Structure formats: structure tokens, C-alpha cells
Amino acid sequence: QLSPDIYAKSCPNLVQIVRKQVAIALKAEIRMAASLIRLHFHDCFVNGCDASLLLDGADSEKLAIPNINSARGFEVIDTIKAAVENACPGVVSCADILTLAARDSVVLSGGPGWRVALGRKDGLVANQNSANNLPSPFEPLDAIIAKFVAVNLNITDVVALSGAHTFGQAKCAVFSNRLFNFTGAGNPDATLETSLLSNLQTVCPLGGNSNITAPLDRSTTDTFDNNYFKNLLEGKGLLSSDQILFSSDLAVNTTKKLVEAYSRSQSLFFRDFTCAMIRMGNISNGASGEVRTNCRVINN
Ligand code: HEM
Ligand SMILES: N[C@@H](CCC(=O)N[C@@H](CS)C(=O)NCC(=O)O)C(=O)O
Ligand SMILES: [Ca+2]
Ligand SMILES: [Ca+2]
């Protein structure tokens, strides 16, 4: 049972300590705000929000197909954790720190804030197999929805949480297939607006460095706002998994209207986003855990 005051006696200043450290990280690299919330997402969708993703090793989740050469911000988490451990030795879990850092990243980026409930335990093992099953930018909308349903989330959560792509980057490798010969017909993805198509072809030329990135949100790259959804109405979503929320056949009577509603009301988007984040932060696999003192390895 989570509670915002679970550390009221054991670590009174936790919230402030984490906030100050997140602000320091964002000052050094603004993209880190995006990277941190993505870590929380990838943590919660595998063995629950138990910091299993932070564990190193030959069988680490960091090597899973969706995480390798992709997930980032591990050094920043170590720094935050070190500050918290200096202030309250062996008290706060890495799982909670990741949750708080995600919330702070949204807030410091102009997004909505919410009171985080604490008390999560850190897992004892990595689940690389499950991490390979994380949502893919290449799969159909129904497949993405099924992955959210599997962890007790739903369609509304899919659309609202996809809004996190209102900031951050995505490498050429996960969207360049939409730029030249998307289906074998020799044409780019027909749902991609031509001016964006032109800019992306410049960023991702055939045979070039596929690790170069482009902003997920072409209007306000670092500001957390509903501009992500406005992009979709114009066919300017970067990943196929973004644009299908508006343009796919399945979206018509499912996600399409939600995308249009968030575009009309940022307050609505912010309300649903906070709601979905809290729900995602409540995912647990019920396995035994502990308060991990070094996020990269178990205590014993
Ligand atoms: C709905 C299914 C989703 C898919 C298919 C997906 C896919 C992706 C992909 C392929 C990237 C680029 C990775 C890279 O460049 O290596 C990315 C980045 C990102 N995703 Fe998602 N994502 C999804 C959901 C979410 C959710 C639920 C959140 C968090 C609440 C999220 C937050 C992020 C952020 C903020 C970035 C930027 C990371 C950075 O710049 O370091 N994503 N996502
Ligand atoms: N999914 C539940 C509702 C859960 C919920 O409250 N979801 C929030 C978003 S996080 C909402 O406003 N709508 C979701 C929904 O209607 O399912 C249901 O269908 O009764
Ligand atoms: Ca996890
Ligand atoms: Ca934005």
C-alpha cells in the first residue's frame, strides 16, 4: 500500500532532495527530462515498477532489443540515489526515486504535477525476455493496446501516455523506414506530411548514421504540452506508433477522437496524463523485494 508520507520519519526531505538533483541534471542536458520518464515507463512495464531495469549484468534488461543503444540516464539516477543515500542511508528504494524523477522531469518541463505515492520495493532480478516485449514503434495499434491491457492499463492510457512524446528524441533507426520505401512500393509512408518528410530525409539519409536523432515533437521540442497531438492532426507525428493514433483504420472510432480532444484542451490532456501516470506507477508483480542501496545490483 503506497503513501506519500511513507518516509515522513525515515527520510523527511526526500522530495526536495530529488527535485534539486533533477534540476541539476536538466541544466546540464535538457533532454534528460525526457530520458528519465522513459526509464520509469520501461521499468513499470517489466516486472512492475521495481527498478529491475536499473540492474546491470549479462542478462540485464538494458540489453533487451528496445533498451540497447536507446535507454539512457543511468548515471543521473546513480547521482540522485547517492544524494538520497547520503541523507538517509538504506531508506529509499530506487523504484521510488525513478518515480519521483519522472514526475519532476515533467513539472520542470512545464507539464502538470501530482503528489507521488511512495513505498515501492526494488526487485531482485532482471527480466530481459519481458523487456523484449515492450511496445514497438513498428507494430499495429491493436498490438500496442494489447500490451497496455496486459498490465491492466487501457486505450485512454495509451493515448495520454503517448503524449510523453511531446519532448525528447528518437533515432533515425526507429522511423527512417517511413521515409523512402515504406511498403515495397518505393514510396514514403503516405501518412507523413511532405514538409516533415523532406526534413527527416535530410536528417536520415540512406546509408548514413542511423543513431542521429530528431525531435519527437517538431513544434516544441523540450516543452511538455499538447503540441504532440496537434502534430498528429497534421500528419506530423514522428514514429509510426505516433501517427497511427490518428490515421490508422483502427483509430477512427477508438483513439482518433481522444487525439482530437487533447488537441482542443491541454487541461484535459494534463488531467488524463496525470491519471495514467499514477496508474502506471501502481503496476507491481507482487514479487519479494528490498530497498536497494546501489541501483545497479541487489543487496545480497
Ligand atoms: C505507446 C507505445 C510507445 C512506443 C511504441 C514508444 C516508442 C519509443 C521509441 C522507439 C523511442 C525512441 C527510442 C530511441 O531513440 O532509441 C521513444 C522515446 C521516448 N519515449 Fe516512447 N514509446 C511508447 C510509450 C511511451 C510512454 C508510455 C512514455 C512515458 C510515459 C514514453 C516516453 C518516451 C520519451 C520521453 C522518449 C524520449 C527519450 C529520450 O529522448 O531519451 N514513451 N519511445
Ligand atoms: N478504465 C476504467 C476507468 C479508469 C479511468 O478512470 N481512466 C481515466 C484515465 S487514466 C479516464 O478518465 N478514462 C479512462 C477510461 O474511461 O477507461 C473504466 O473503463 O471504467
Ligand atoms: Ca521493472
Ligand atoms: Ca512539446
Short mmCIF file of N, CA, C and O in Angstrom, two decimals, residues 31 33-35 37-38 41 70 137 161-172 174-175 178 192 196 199-200 213-223 225 227-232 235-243:
data_model
loop_
_atom_site.label_atom_id
_atom_site.label_comp_id
_atom_site.label_asym_id
_atom_site.label_seq_id
_atom_site.Cartn_x
_atom_site.Cartn_y
_atom_site.Cartn_z
N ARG A 31 17.53 17.26 -22.48
CA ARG A 31 16.92 16.01 -22.95
C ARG A 31 16.72 14.98 -21.83
O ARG A 31 15.87 14.08 -21.94
N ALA A 33 15.23 15.15 -19.15
CA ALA A 33 13.88 15.16 -18.58
C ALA A 33 13.10 14.05 -19.29
O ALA A 33 12.41 13.24 -18.65
N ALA A 34 13.24 14.01 -20.61
CA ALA A 34 12.57 13.01 -21.43
C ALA A 34 13.13 11.62 -21.13
O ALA A 34 12.37 10.67 -20.95
N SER A 35 14.45 11.51 -21.08
CA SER A 35 15.10 10.22 -20.82
C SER A 35 14.66 9.59 -19.50
O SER A 35 14.41 8.39 -19.44
N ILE A 37 11.77 10.01 -17.67
CA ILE A 37 10.42 9.49 -17.61
C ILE A 37 10.34 8.22 -18.46
O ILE A 37 9.59 7.31 -18.15
N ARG A 38 11.14 8.14 -19.52
CA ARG A 38 11.11 6.93 -20.33
C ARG A 38 11.63 5.74 -19.50
O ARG A 38 11.14 4.62 -19.65
N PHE A 41 8.82 4.44 -17.46
CA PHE A 41 7.91 3.68 -18.33
C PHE A 41 8.47 2.27 -18.54
O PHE A 41 7.77 1.28 -18.29
N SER A 70 19.72 2.71 -26.54
CA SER A 70 18.49 3.52 -26.53
C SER A 70 18.15 4.14 -25.17
O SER A 70 18.04 5.36 -25.05
N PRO A 137 7.68 0.74 -32.07
CA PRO A 137 7.25 1.82 -32.95
C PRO A 137 6.74 1.27 -34.28
O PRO A 137 6.05 1.97 -35.03
N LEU A 161 -0.53 8.65 -22.31
CA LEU A 161 0.89 8.43 -22.05
C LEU A 161 1.75 8.57 -23.31
O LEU A 161 2.94 8.84 -23.23
N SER A 162 1.15 8.40 -24.49
CA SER A 162 1.90 8.58 -25.73
C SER A 162 2.25 10.06 -25.83
O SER A 162 3.18 10.45 -26.55
N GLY A 163 1.51 10.88 -25.08
CA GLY A 163 1.74 12.31 -25.06
C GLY A 163 3.10 12.69 -24.49
O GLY A 163 3.53 13.83 -24.62
N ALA A 164 3.77 11.73 -23.86
CA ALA A 164 5.10 11.97 -23.30
C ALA A 164 6.06 12.24 -24.46
O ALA A 164 7.19 12.71 -24.24
N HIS A 165 5.64 11.93 -25.68
CA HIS A 165 6.49 12.19 -26.84
C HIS A 165 6.42 13.66 -27.22
O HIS A 165 6.82 14.04 -28.33
N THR A 166 5.90 14.49 -26.32
CA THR A 166 5.81 15.93 -26.54
C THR A 166 7.20 16.55 -26.32
O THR A 166 7.42 17.74 -26.56
N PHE A 167 8.12 15.73 -25.82
CA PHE A 167 9.51 16.13 -25.66
C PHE A 167 10.41 14.92 -25.88
O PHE A 167 9.92 13.79 -26.01
N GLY A 168 11.72 15.14 -26.00
CA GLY A 168 12.62 14.02 -26.22
C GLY A 168 13.00 13.79 -27.67
O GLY A 168 12.53 14.49 -28.56
N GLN A 169 13.82 12.78 -27.90
CA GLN A 169 14.31 12.43 -29.24
C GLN A 169 13.99 10.98 -29.63
O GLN A 169 13.59 10.18 -28.80
N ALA A 170 14.20 10.67 -30.91
CA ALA A 170 14.04 9.33 -31.46
C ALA A 170 15.09 9.21 -32.57
O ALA A 170 15.23 10.11 -33.39
N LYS A 171 15.83 8.10 -32.58
CA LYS A 171 16.87 7.89 -33.59
C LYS A 171 16.30 7.51 -34.95
O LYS A 171 15.21 6.96 -35.06
N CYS A 172 17.07 7.82 -35.99
CA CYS A 172 16.69 7.51 -37.36
C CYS A 172 16.22 6.06 -37.51
O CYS A 172 15.23 5.79 -38.18
N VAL A 174 14.50 4.08 -35.80
CA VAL A 174 13.12 3.70 -35.49
C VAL A 174 12.03 4.38 -36.32
O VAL A 174 10.84 4.20 -36.04
N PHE A 175 12.42 5.16 -37.34
CA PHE A 175 11.42 5.80 -38.19
C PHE A 175 11.85 6.03 -39.64
O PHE A 175 11.02 6.37 -40.48
N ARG A 178 9.98 4.89 -42.84
CA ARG A 178 8.83 5.64 -43.34
C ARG A 178 9.22 6.65 -44.41
O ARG A 178 8.35 7.22 -45.07
N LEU A 192 2.69 10.56 -43.80
CA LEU A 192 3.67 11.55 -43.33
C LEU A 192 3.61 12.85 -44.15
O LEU A 192 3.84 12.84 -45.35
N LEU A 196 7.63 17.68 -43.42
CA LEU A 196 8.33 16.96 -42.38
C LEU A 196 9.14 15.85 -43.05
O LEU A 196 10.30 15.63 -42.72
N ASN A 199 12.40 17.20 -44.32
CA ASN A 199 13.39 17.45 -43.28
C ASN A 199 13.97 16.15 -42.73
O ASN A 199 15.17 16.06 -42.49
N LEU A 200 13.11 15.16 -42.51
CA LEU A 200 13.58 13.88 -41.98
C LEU A 200 14.51 13.15 -42.95
O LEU A 200 15.46 12.48 -42.53
N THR A 213 19.51 11.60 -34.09
CA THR A 213 18.12 11.72 -33.66
C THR A 213 17.39 12.95 -34.21
O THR A 213 18.01 13.87 -34.75
N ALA A 214 16.08 12.92 -34.07
CA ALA A 214 15.21 14.01 -34.49
C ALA A 214 14.25 14.20 -33.32
O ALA A 214 13.99 13.27 -32.56
N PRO A 215 13.70 15.42 -33.15
CA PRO A 215 12.77 15.70 -32.05
C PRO A 215 11.45 14.96 -32.25
O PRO A 215 10.91 14.96 -33.35
N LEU A 216 10.94 14.35 -31.19
CA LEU A 216 9.66 13.65 -31.28
C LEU A 216 8.57 14.68 -31.54
O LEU A 216 7.61 14.41 -32.25
N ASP A 217 8.72 15.86 -30.95
CA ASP A 217 7.75 16.94 -31.14
C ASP A 217 8.42 18.07 -31.90
O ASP A 217 9.23 18.81 -31.35
N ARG A 218 8.06 18.19 -33.17
CA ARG A 218 8.64 19.20 -34.03
C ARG A 218 8.29 20.66 -33.73
O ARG A 218 8.96 21.56 -34.22
N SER A 219 7.25 20.90 -32.94
CA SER A 219 6.87 22.28 -32.62
C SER A 219 7.57 22.79 -31.37
O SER A 219 8.25 23.82 -31.41
N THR A 220 7.41 22.08 -30.25
CA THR A 220 8.08 22.48 -29.01
C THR A 220 8.85 21.27 -28.50
O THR A 220 8.35 20.48 -27.70
N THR A 221 10.09 21.16 -28.97
CA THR A 221 10.97 20.03 -28.64
C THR A 221 11.15 19.69 -27.16
O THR A 221 11.15 18.52 -26.80
N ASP A 222 11.29 20.71 -26.32
CA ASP A 222 11.52 20.47 -24.89
C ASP A 222 10.37 20.83 -23.95
O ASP A 222 10.42 20.50 -22.77
N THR A 223 9.34 21.49 -24.45
CA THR A 223 8.23 21.89 -23.59
C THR A 223 7.15 20.81 -23.51
O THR A 223 6.69 20.30 -24.53
N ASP A 225 3.75 19.84 -23.46
CA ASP A 225 2.46 20.43 -23.82
C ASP A 225 1.67 19.51 -24.75
O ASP A 225 2.14 18.43 -25.11
N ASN A 227 1.09 19.95 -27.80
CA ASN A 227 1.51 20.14 -29.18
C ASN A 227 1.75 18.81 -29.87
O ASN A 227 1.67 18.72 -31.10
N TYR A 228 2.04 17.76 -29.10
CA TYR A 228 2.25 16.43 -29.68
C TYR A 228 1.03 15.98 -30.47
O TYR A 228 1.14 15.46 -31.59
N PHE A 229 -0.15 16.17 -29.89
CA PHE A 229 -1.40 15.77 -30.52
C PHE A 229 -1.76 16.67 -31.69
O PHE A 229 -2.29 16.19 -32.70
N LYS A 230 -1.46 17.96 -31.58
CA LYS A 230 -1.75 18.88 -32.67
C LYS A 230 -0.95 18.45 -33.90
O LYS A 230 -1.43 18.58 -35.03
N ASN A 231 0.26 17.94 -33.67
CA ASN A 231 1.13 17.46 -34.75
C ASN A 231 0.42 16.34 -35.51
O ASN A 231 0.41 16.31 -36.75
N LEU A 232 -0.17 15.40 -34.78
CA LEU A 232 -0.85 14.27 -35.39
C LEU A 232 -1.99 14.67 -36.32
O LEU A 232 -2.20 14.05 -37.36
N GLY A 235 -0.58 15.19 -39.55
CA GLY A 235 0.24 14.12 -40.08
C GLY A 235 1.71 14.37 -39.81
O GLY A 235 2.57 13.98 -40.61
N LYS A 236 2.03 15.02 -38.69
CA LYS A 236 3.42 15.31 -38.37
C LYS A 236 3.97 14.54 -37.17
O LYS A 236 4.89 15.00 -36.49
N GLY A 237 3.42 13.36 -36.93
CA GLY A 237 3.91 12.54 -35.83
C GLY A 237 5.19 11.89 -36.33
O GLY A 237 5.26 11.51 -37.50
N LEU A 238 6.21 11.76 -35.48
CA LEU A 238 7.48 11.17 -35.92
C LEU A 238 7.49 9.64 -36.08
O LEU A 238 7.89 9.14 -37.12
N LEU A 239 7.06 8.92 -35.06
CA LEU A 239 7.05 7.45 -35.13
C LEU A 239 5.73 6.99 -35.76
O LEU A 239 4.73 7.69 -35.69
N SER A 240 5.73 5.81 -36.38
CA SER A 240 4.50 5.29 -36.96
C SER A 240 3.54 5.10 -35.79
O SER A 240 2.34 5.38 -35.90
N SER A 241 4.08 4.64 -34.66
CA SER A 241 3.27 4.41 -33.47
C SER A 241 2.62 5.69 -32.95
O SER A 241 1.69 5.63 -32.14
N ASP A 242 3.10 6.85 -33.40
CA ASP A 242 2.50 8.12 -33.01
C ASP A 242 1.36 8.40 -33.98
O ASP A 242 0.20 8.50 -33.59
N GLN A 243 1.69 8.50 -35.27
CA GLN A 243 0.70 8.80 -36.29
C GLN A 243 -0.49 7.84 -36.41
O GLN A 243 -1.58 8.27 -36.77
#
